[PDB]
Amino acid sequence: TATLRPYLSAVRATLQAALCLENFSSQVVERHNKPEVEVRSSKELLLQPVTISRNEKEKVLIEGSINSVRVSIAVKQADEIEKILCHKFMRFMMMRAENFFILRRKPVEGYDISFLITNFHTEQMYKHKLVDFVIHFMEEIDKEISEMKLSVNARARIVAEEFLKNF
Amino acid sequence: MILLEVNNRIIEETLALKFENAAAGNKPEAVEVTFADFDGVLYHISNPNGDKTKVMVSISLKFYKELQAHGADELLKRVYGSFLVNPESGYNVSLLYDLENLPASKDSIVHQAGMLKRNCFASVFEKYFQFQEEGKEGENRAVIHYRDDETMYVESKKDRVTVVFSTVFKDDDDVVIGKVFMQEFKEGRRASHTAPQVLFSHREPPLELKDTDAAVGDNIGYITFVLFPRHTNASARDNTINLIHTFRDYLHYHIKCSKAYIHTRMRAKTSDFLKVLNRARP
Amino acid sequence: MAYHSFLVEPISCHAWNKDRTQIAICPNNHEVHIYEKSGAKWTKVHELKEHNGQVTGIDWAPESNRIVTCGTDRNAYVWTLKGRTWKPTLVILRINRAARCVRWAPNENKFAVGSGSRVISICYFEQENDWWVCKHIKKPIRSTVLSLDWHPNNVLLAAGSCDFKCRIFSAYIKEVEERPAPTPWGSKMPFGELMFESSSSCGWVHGVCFSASGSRVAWVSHDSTVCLADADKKMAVATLASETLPLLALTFITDNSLVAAGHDCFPVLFTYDAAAGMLSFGGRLDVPKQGLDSLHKNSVSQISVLSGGKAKCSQFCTTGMDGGMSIWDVKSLESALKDLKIK
Amino acid sequence: ARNTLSSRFRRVDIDEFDENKFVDEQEEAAAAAAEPGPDPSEVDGLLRQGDMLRAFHAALRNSPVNTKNQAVKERAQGVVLKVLTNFKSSEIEQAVQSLDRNGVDLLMKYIYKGFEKPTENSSAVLLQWHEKALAVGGLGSIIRVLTARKTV
Amino acid sequence: LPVELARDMQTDTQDHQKLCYSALILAMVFSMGEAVPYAHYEHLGTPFAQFLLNIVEDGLPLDTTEQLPDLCVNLLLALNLHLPAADQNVIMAALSKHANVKIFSEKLLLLLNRGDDPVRIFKHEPQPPHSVLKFLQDVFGSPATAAIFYHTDMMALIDITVRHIADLSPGDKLRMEYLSLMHAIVRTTPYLQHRHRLPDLQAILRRILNEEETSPQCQMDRMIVREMCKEFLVLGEAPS
């Protein structure tokens, strides 16, 4: 309940700060190359978590590292019919996580979706476009739910007419 | 398929196979089939005593004591007539169709065999629909337990017939969508002006039934149907009953099928986002 | 201000020969591809294929013409050009984890490898068995080592680690060199002696370079804090916290000025005044190009000095994750930026 | 297929009892006595008279970074976060521009801590603060929040 | 021209292409909001709107691709641009006369959820107002036209309007439109009986009053909020 322009302006700046990444071979297993933010074996390689928030419900969590970033997001869910449609939408977005290369197949606890960005994505993909996908997501998700709430309500009328019309 | 069919496929499919084989002169083939329908129904088609010329369509409704009352034992007889015989064991009703003594024009007895569940429910409506036409008020309501955790209360008055469903939504994702579907049945008289009035009390029952040992809960739902005499008259009571005994299943059919509409639409929006990411792929 | 895109994927490491006629990149794989400068073109002449893993550090000894590699496979290989092909020569590092950096010594009698095994391996030659045996320096260190640079005495060694520190060690090997001369860093320089340990404990040390005099050392960190220690001034440290993304590699172009580059995708300059005792931002070097506004379209991981040495450099090279290698001409930047000054 | 031998040895985790685990350092001198932090009466008496810009510097002068205790840190956060929330939106650029570099970085640390647990309108303000401190300090200010091993 | 197209469309409904282009050109020329002669309202008045609503709701048989409803919507939005004083509006008399509109209302919200002006095809200055909000401000300028929305749709309209008031930044031109739209809903609907999203609304208006911006536009927003809270006090109370 603040405004949308500064929120995405803060998140966009923190992301550029946290996508300063490089390759890093492991120091606990012989020749592994993992994202240290997920395994969390080496505390020194884990930067601080930082949070951003318009309000209590909406917020973002950037857990950075030397070779990984984790961007958990919480979306606003005013009513129950919006909690449902957001829960399904992420499931159908996680199911195609091999195509969203920066995506986690499950979300962080307390959040609705979570991204994961390794040092191989910045080398291959355009670092500044990945940010624009996270930001484009955060401002379109509210529109793509109400468009479904309106689509459920429109369906419920036809299902009523097609029953009462026959009387 | 928006509207549910009232006549079972397996009966119309099975009998017409026998009836078309015998009337073609071919020999009869045996049969032993158990199956089901909505509302806890259980059918059984069989050759009684091994006689492959006779087929016996039985059915095992629970709550049939509630239907033997209201005079359903007479309603079913006025339709099938000779075909109705003593009940098979464990089953409440039993027809019998003789393959060597078939009449021509078999599509009528077949189509009436599929409607056996309908012809059983059709008594409690025809009784109360007549009370309004006769002006009889003060009679007792009809409590029918069409499922173990649900109930159907009927009642008649001077100008209307009131039909109630004490349905139940297992999941909490269903009771949320259910409020949406029922909140539009209430406004259904905006398009269809002749249509019946509908109401919806989420947890608690209405005032007509609070005395009647009704159930309350965060998942139950009480759904009313006000039927005026342009529905309950002789020319429309058949098509009215053909819809009212399928409402509980019509509602849940479209809650489960609305999820598929949602799923169908999120697989697309997910592919719209995925075009934005591939901008990052060189 | 050239830019030759060798490929689209990163270039983990690079090294030049003496003549600056050939270059040895690692195109994000297990191979070392040696390219030669044919006129205004680049042609590949050799490919070294012995590693079971990705390469992280390369150095080319100018006189002996002996290339040394280090990779994630816990290996190193010393290459000698026999006829027309390069042949390796085995190394015994004795590390349980992967390697991250390597630098030849000035006198080309040893090299030092920094690894994720929380050690540094000082390697020298053994003709008794044709091996290169190694000795370890792992007394204070507690995590991976990212960068190294040799003092001009061919003994002292600086090392930037992920322990947030830039220690300095004495890599004295009795079998191959006599005891060194003293230095303002200290006289007691046996094998494995911590001379100077920085004070800051925030950010990972990505790059380290010694000064041509040997009395000044600077180090870059992920905290966007360049630093510089002066031994003449009792090992006092001067920081300059930046207001942009971090840097990943530095080098002394002169005894006073430096050049750094990293995640900001361009080089910059840093000036030191021992009179005042601080560093100052010498401005961005490359002009904003007429989204990114430079030649390197991704980060930069390694910077090197082609012409003029660290005493006074005329050309330096940048090598980045964008599969590119950009040569710079120092005086051309002095001219193209009349405001720019190199102290 | 399936195995039919005792495979319980693979369940116990021996890596917990390890000697090579990282150990970060702390200020020994602060464990005995902690930094007192910005005293409330100092800042508050400057807030009664409305001198916000001086109560501002009084809160950033003292900061218990070297303290291992969390309550004095929490008390310190509530003090400065109480101060930033009472500012006038036009006065913030006047205040941020006064600070030196090392105060802008400490400010942005406290800002990213206010986003953790917000009140009704604690965050619409901090986003305005975030805009100004970024205009002065740039992305390098945020990086000294991520790399900071010692919380505010 | 607009009188012959509006006369050929009501008469020659067989030709599908001519009916679809006629409805496009009519939206082009009415896009700018300029007024018109009074004589145009013999064929562009209320009977022409009922013709367009019957198409939006019921459609035509010859419309196989179903382009025409989304063109007869964009046209109604454009006729209502130059039309002031919703009580004197010819279109609103069409809605209040129609038996039941649902498809026209469903489509107005799918345009408001995104804030897209389908009438604004051309990049010509002076840019006229927002055709959708101009419409809904005029719908809720009278209680006869407000009851067209089903219950489930009004609650979706309040969820959207509230979301835009907050997500919009100060100094924007549209924020006062959503505010004037919201002020119109409270008057002409029983919003104070169900109070959907009232707490989230109360917190947003207190914010807008406590905003220290000084642009003229931002003072027009605060000027509306005070009138809104003054008229209906319960929008000024603290969220509880």
Side-chain angles (χ1 to χ4, degrees), chain A residues 1-4 6-167, chain B residues 1-74 79 81-282, chain C residues 1-133 135-136 139-166 168-196 198-343, chain D residues 1-60 62-152, chain E:
Chain A
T1 59
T3 296
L4 188 63
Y7 184 57
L8 315 183
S9 304
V11 170
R12 187 189 280 279
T14 318
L15 272 161
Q16 297 184 35
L19 294 178
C20 301
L21 308 168
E22 55 170 24
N23 191 342
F24 183 84
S25 296
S26 64
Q27 58 187 13
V28 289
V29 187
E30 192 205 314
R31 321 209 296 279
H32 282 197
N33 190 319
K34 304 293 180 62
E36 298 290 356
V37 69
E38 278 292 353
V39 314
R40 313 186 75 76
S41 64
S42 304
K43 305 289 133 188
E44 70 206 331
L45 312 178
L46 300 182
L47 303 176
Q48 278 211 287
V50 301
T51 312
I52 303 97
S53 78
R54 297 178 51 173
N55 50 24
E56 308 100 332
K57 316 308 187 193
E58 313 201 48
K59 46 170 170 157
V60 174
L61 176 60
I62 299 106
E63 296 161 314
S65 181
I66 186 166
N67 64 328
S68 54
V69 187
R70 195 161 72 194
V71 188
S72 306
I73 309 183
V75 183
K76 177 157 181 66
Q77 291 154 12
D79 37 5
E80 300 297 289
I81 188 68
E82 282 182 9
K83 295 176 173 163
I84 292 168
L85 302 161
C86 184
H87 180 276
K88 298 183 179 288
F89 188 13
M90 302 305 156
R91 176 59 198 154
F92 283 93
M93 185 176 291
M94 290 167 186
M95 285 152 57
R96 296 186 71 182
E98 281 180 11
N99 318 60
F100 302 90
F101 295 94
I102 60 170
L103 199 55
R104 272 174 104 270
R105 274 149 172 163
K106 301 190 192 308
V108 174
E109 194 187 336
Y111 297 91
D112 303 323
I113 194 168
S114 286
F115 301 84
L116 176 78
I117 297 156
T118 37
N119 72 278
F120 302 108
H121 303 158
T122 76
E123 295 162 16
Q124 299 156 18
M125 266 161 280
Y126 290 138
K127 189 191 302 190
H128 60 278
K129 289 283 189 171
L130 302 179
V131 175
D132 289 323
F133 175 77
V134 182
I135 301 302
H136 168 265
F137 176 91
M138 295 148 80
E139 59 186 350
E140 292 278 323
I141 185 64
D142 295 322
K143 292 192 276 286
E144 297 288 5
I145 293 160
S146 207
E147 182 167 355
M148 292 299 307
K149 193 197 292 185
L150 296 157
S151 293
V152 172
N153 303 358
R155 171 151 181 151
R157 315 209 161 109
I158 301 157
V159 167
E161 293 183 6
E162 293 287 335
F163 186 72
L164 305 176
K165 170 177 74 177
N166 297 98
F167 275 87
Chain B
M1 192 176 72
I2 294 147
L3 279 161
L4 298 184
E5 303 172 352
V6 290
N7 54 344
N8 202 328
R9 295 225 159 198
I10 293 152
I11 294 161
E12 302 181 340
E13 185 191 59
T14 306
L15 302 177
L17 184 70
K18 308 299 182 190
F19 286 13
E20 193 184 12
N21 276 10
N26 302 309
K27 66 187 66 51
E29 207 185 326
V31 56
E32 188 78 358
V33 188
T34 193
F35 62 95
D37 208 51
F38 306 123
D39 295 332
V41 168
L42 184 85
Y43 282 87
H44 187 15
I45 292 162
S46 54
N47 299 123
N49 311 128
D51 193 352
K52 293 164 55 173
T53 46
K54 323 308 200 81
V55 314
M56 158 165 280
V57 186
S58 303
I59 188 174
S60 183
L61 269 60
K62 304 204 294 192
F63 67 86
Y64 187 70
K65 303 283 280 297
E66 291 79 311
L67 288 159
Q68 288 192 272
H70 300 291
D73 289 345
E74 293 177 350
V79 175
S82 53
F83 299 120
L84 173 52
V85 310
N86 305 86
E88 200 195 325
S89 185
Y91 286 60
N92 303 88
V93 176
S94 294
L95 300 174
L96 202 156
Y97 292 70
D98 200 332
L99 290 172
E100 296 179 341
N101 191 41
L102 293 170
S105 86
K106 306 184 193 68
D107 294 335
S108 46
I109 62 178
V110 157
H111 184 26
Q112 290 289 312
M115 293 157 63
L116 178 55
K117 186 191 168 217
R118 191 279 203 184
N119 289 337
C120 298
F121 279 85
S123 64
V124 61
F125 299 119
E126 283 187 350
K127 163 165 155 172
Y128 283 73
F129 289 2
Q130 195 64 269
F131 287 7
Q132 192 276 338
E133 204 159 40
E134 297 173 348
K136 302 187 164 183
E137 292 199 318
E139 311 308 73
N140 314 134
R141 57 172 89 272
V143 186
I144 288 165
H145 307 76
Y146 66 109
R147 308 180 87 270
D148 286 316
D149 56 357
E150 301 185 23
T151 302
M152 200 175 82
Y153 316 93
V154 197
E155 192 176 51
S156 174
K157 300 181 193 178
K158 193 208 298 302
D159 53 326
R160 61 174 71 86
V161 183
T162 307
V163 176
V164 175
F165 298 92
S166 171
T167 195
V168 60
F169 304 92
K170 288 178 73 180
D171 198 341
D172 298 8
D173 302 11
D174 286 1
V175 73
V176 170
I177 296 157
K179 291 171 190 172
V180 174
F181 272 83
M182 300 308 312
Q183 181 50 84
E184 302 295 345
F185 275 100
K186 281 139 66 174
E187 315 194 60
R189 311 211 305 288
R190 278 187 56 161
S192 300
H193 316 82
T194 65
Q197 169 168 13
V198 180
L199 297 96
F200 180 71
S201 176
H202 179 21
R203 303 172 70 271
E204 57 160 19
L207 319 183
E208 287 74 339
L209 317 177
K210 59 185 301 312
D211 67 88
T212 61
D213 200 70
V216 296
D218 284 311
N219 290 42
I220 293 148
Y222 285 81
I223 301 149
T224 317
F225 262 88
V226 174
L227 301 169
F228 305 114
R230 89 198 74 91
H231 315 127
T232 76
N233 70 69
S235 195
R237 61 176 73 178
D238 301 317
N239 189 91
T240 297
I241 293 157
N242 291 0
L243 298 170
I244 291 284
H245 93 283
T246 59
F247 170 74
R248 190 266 179 199
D249 301 312
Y250 181 88
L251 183 71
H252 293 73
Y253 175 55
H254 281 279
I255 293 166
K256 300 178 200 317
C257 290
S258 177
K259 293 163 183 171
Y261 173 74
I262 295 166
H263 301 180
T264 298
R265 279 187 58 82
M266 298 292 183
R267 294 197 182 87
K269 298 181 187 307
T270 295
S271 306
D272 302 356
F273 278 102
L274 190 58
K275 303 205 180 77
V276 173
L277 180 55
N278 302 344
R279 297 176 184 166
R281 287 220 296 278
Chain C
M1 292 149 56
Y3 179 60
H4 175 240
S5 197
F6 277 104
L7 64 152
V8 196
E9 318 189 329
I11 292 144
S12 300
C13 175
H14 77 272
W16 293 91
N17 56 346
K18 188 185 278 189
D19 308 340
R20 313 322 201 200
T21 305
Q22 284 188 130
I23 190 181
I25 60 182
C26 183
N28 197 34
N29 63 340
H30 304 1
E31 305 179 342
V32 186
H33 290 176
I34 294 159
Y35 293 82
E36 194 180 45
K37 179 54 160 167
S38 303
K41 308 300 296 305
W42 284 102
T43 56
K44 184 160 63 172
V45 289
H46 298 90
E47 297 196 41
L48 318 185
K49 297 177 184 84
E50 191 66 41
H51 281 287
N52 294 310
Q54 180 156 14
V55 185
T56 51
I58 302 158
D59 201 349
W60 203 327
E63 196 201 54
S64 314
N65 202 31
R66 294 191 299 178
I67 298 165
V68 69
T69 59
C70 64
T72 61
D73 58 327
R74 313 200 280 120
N75 268 334
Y77 293 121
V78 176
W79 303 85
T80 59
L81 176 47
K82 321 189 86 76
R84 59 185 67 183
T85 52
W86 295 80
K87 312 307 298 185
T89 312
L90 191 54
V91 190
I92 304 299
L93 286 163
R94 313 200 314 275
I95 65 185
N96 59 341
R97 304 275 182 281
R100 187 62 173 76
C101 51
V102 69
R103 297 292 291 275
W104 265 125
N107 304 336
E108 307 181 24
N109 59 326
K110 57 170 82 78
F111 56 89
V113 173
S115 64
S117 186
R118 311 187 175 82
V119 307
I120 295 166
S121 306
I122 314 308
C123 294
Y124 53 92
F125 188 72
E126 189 183 43
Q127 194 56 279
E128 298 173 0
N129 301 332
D130 289 345
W131 280 323
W132 285 74
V133 74
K135 295 174 68 165
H136 279 346
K139 278 167 186 178
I141 303 158
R142 319 196 313 288
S143 81
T144 300
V145 177
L146 304 194
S147 191
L148 303 169
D149 196 356
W150 282 100
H151 198 256
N153 61 23
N154 201 91
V155 189
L156 276 173
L157 176 60
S161 69
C162 294
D163 286 323
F164 315 137
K165 305 297 189 72
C166 175
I168 290 165
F169 298 97
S170 158
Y172 169 59
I173 308 291
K174 61 190 165 50
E175 297 110 321
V176 293
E177 56 178 4
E178 290 292 343
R179 283 200 75 263
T183 172
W185 298 103
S187 177
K188 180 177 180 286
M189 307 193 298
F191 185 72
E193 197 73 354
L194 176 52
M195 313 311 296
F196 160 69
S198 61
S199 304
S200 174
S201 71
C202 293
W204 311 297
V205 183
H206 291 128
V208 162
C209 202
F210 264 123
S211 52
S213 47
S215 49
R216 299 180 203 173
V217 64
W219 66 84
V220 154
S221 294
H222 200 93
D223 199 59
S224 291
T225 51
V226 71
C227 289
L228 203 161
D230 211 326
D232 302 88
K233 308 176 71 170
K234 293 189 287 185
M235 298 178 189
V237 288
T239 80
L240 172 46
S242 183
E243 58 177 59
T244 54
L245 307 183
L247 293 161
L248 303 176
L250 60 92
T251 188
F252 277 105
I253 52 167
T254 68
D255 205 291
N256 287 86
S257 176
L258 295 87
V259 175
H263 287 291
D264 279 281
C265 298
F266 49 70
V268 305
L269 190 136
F270 281 91
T271 296
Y272 184 51
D273 274 12
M278 61 167 54
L279 291 151
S280 50
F281 188 71
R284 172 174 170 170
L285 293 189
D286 73 320
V287 72
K289 189 53 51 177
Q290 304 174 251
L292 293 78
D293 59 280
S294 168
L295 300 83
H296 278 318
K297 300 297 180 298
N298 213 325
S299 305
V300 177
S301 47
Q302 189 171 313
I303 202 165
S304 189
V305 180
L306 322 183
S307 299
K310 298 166 188 180
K312 198 181 81 66
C313 165
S314 58
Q315 304 205 144
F316 58 98
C317 174
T318 43
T319 294
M321 301 177 186
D322 64 324
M325 184 281 307
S326 289
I327 296 159
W328 307 87
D329 195 281
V330 175
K331 309 199 311 314
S332 181
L333 310 197
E334 300 182 320
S335 171
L337 296 104
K338 61 191 175 187
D339 182 21
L340 185 69
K341 307 173 280 145
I342 295 168
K343 312 309 199 77
Chain D
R2 191 167 66 160
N3 68 335
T4 75
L5 295 95
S6 172
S7 189
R8 327 306 169 205
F9 71 101
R10 251 188 284 271
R11 312 312 313 164
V12 61
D13 194 301
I14 57 170
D15 187 22
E16 190 71 1
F17 306 90
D18 188 79
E19 304 297 331
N20 318 75
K21 300 232 175 66
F22 185 81
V23 197
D24 201 337
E25 276 280 294
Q26 63 289 8
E27 196 72 48
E28 178 56 28
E35 182 177 350
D39 188 296
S41 60
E42 182 175 357
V43 294
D44 194 1
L46 272 282
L47 290 170
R48 296 174 208 290
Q49 69 207 56
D51 196 339
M52 283 281 181
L53 185 135
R54 294 275 290 287
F56 189 65
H57 290 295
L60 305 173
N62 275 322
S63 53
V65 174
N66 300 91
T67 68
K68 316 189 300 189
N69 179 15
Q70 278 288 307
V72 293
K73 282 172 151 148
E74 277 165 314
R75 296 174 233 173
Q77 290 163 20
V79 160
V80 62
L81 295 164
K82 172 174 69 173
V83 166
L84 303 161
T85 55
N86 310 148
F87 263 74
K88 198 177 286 187
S89 308
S90 69
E91 273 59 7
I92 289 166
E93 189 178 358
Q94 196 207 335
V96 169
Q97 190 62 262
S98 77
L99 295 161
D100 58 318
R101 191 201 311 277
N102 303 120
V104 164
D105 308 359
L106 175 55
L107 180 69
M108 196 77 87
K109 286 186 173 65
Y110 281 115
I111 282 161
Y112 279 105
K113 187 67 69 176
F115 293 141
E116 304 296 318
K117 48 193 294 185
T119 67
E120 211 77 344
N121 196 259
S122 292
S123 283
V125 176
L126 286 165
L127 291 169
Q128 293 176 356
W129 279 101
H130 189 273
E131 177 171 359
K132 311 313 192 185
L134 184 71
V136 185
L139 306 173
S141 287
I142 291 153
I143 288 155
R144 299 190 276 287
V145 179
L146 309 182
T147 57
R149 296 289 297 166
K150 284 294 209 71
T151 319
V152 290
Chain E
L1 188 82
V3 196
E4 183 61 19
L5 307 181
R7 190 216 63 71
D8 199 357
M9 292 157 57
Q10 297 184 65
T11 289
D12 199 1
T13 55
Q14 304 297 101
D15 204 327
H16 179 66
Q17 286 284 110
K18 200 179 76 176
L19 206 76
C20 295
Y21 274 91
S22 297
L24 181 73
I25 304 306
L26 278 163
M28 290 173 156
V29 306
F30 278 100
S31 59
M32 311 309 298
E34 307 309 330
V36 306
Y38 173 77
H40 300 291
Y41 300 125
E42 286 177 14
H43 310 84
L44 291 151
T46 315
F48 184 57
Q50 291 170 340
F51 173 77
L52 295 171
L53 278 156
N54 286 336
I55 289 160
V56 169
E57 301 286 339
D58 307 282
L60 295 180
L62 294 90
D63 190 3
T64 60
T65 311
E66 305 293 351
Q67 319 172 44
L68 194 62
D70 305 71
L71 293 172
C72 301
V73 167
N74 303 352
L75 173 46
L76 289 159
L77 300 179
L79 288 176
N80 202 88
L81 266 180
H82 65 273
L83 276 164
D87 66 291
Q88 301 170 11
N89 193 317
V90 305
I91 292 157
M92 296 293 142
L95 302 172
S96 49
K97 282 177 211 315
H98 206 95
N100 163 45
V101 317
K102 61 173 182 291
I103 290 131
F104 182 66
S105 83
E106 284 169 5
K107 291 182 179 292
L108 284 175
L109 304 172
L110 302 161
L111 300 161
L112 187 67
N113 182 26
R114 307 201 164 282
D116 54 352
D117 197 1
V119 184
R120 184 70 186 161
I121 299 132
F122 308 123
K123 311 298 159 193
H124 298 334
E125 316 305 83
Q127 191 175 294
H130 200 281
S131 63
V132 194
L133 297 159
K134 210 289 195 174
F135 201 100
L136 298 155
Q137 284 175 37
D138 296 4
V139 171
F140 294 105
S142 173
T145 47
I148 67 176
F149 282 86
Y150 287 73
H151 193 81
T152 48
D153 273 0
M154 198 82 81
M155 304 300 173
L157 174 56
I158 292 155
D159 295 7
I160 295 159
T161 298
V162 168
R163 161 163 69 75
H164 278 112
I165 291 157
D167 290 9
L168 282 168
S169 298
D172 201 321
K173 317 191 306 313
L174 293 168
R175 194 170 58 159
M176 61 178 180
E177 306 298 339
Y178 290 102
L179 275 157
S180 312
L181 170 54
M182 202 76 211
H183 188 193
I185 292 172
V186 184
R187 298 191 244 198
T188 54
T189 69
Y191 178 81
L192 302 173
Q193 314 294 20
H194 58 73
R195 307 190 160 194
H196 191 58
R197 297 287 292 284
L198 181 60
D200 301 321
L201 182 59
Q202 286 183 96
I204 293 160
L205 305 185
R206 289 192 299 93
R207 189 191 85 200
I208 284 162
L209 290 179
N210 288 253
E211 276 187 343
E212 290 157 10
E213 298 288 358
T214 65
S215 186
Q217 184 62 37
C218 307
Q219 279 167 25
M220 186 63 72
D221 304 357
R222 297 197 288 261
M223 185 176 291
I224 294 154
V225 176
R226 293 186 247 272
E227 190 193 349
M228 199 197 303
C229 296
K230 179 167 76 201
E231 184 170 4
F232 308 99
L233 277 294
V234 68
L235 316 186
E237 296 172 0
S240 296

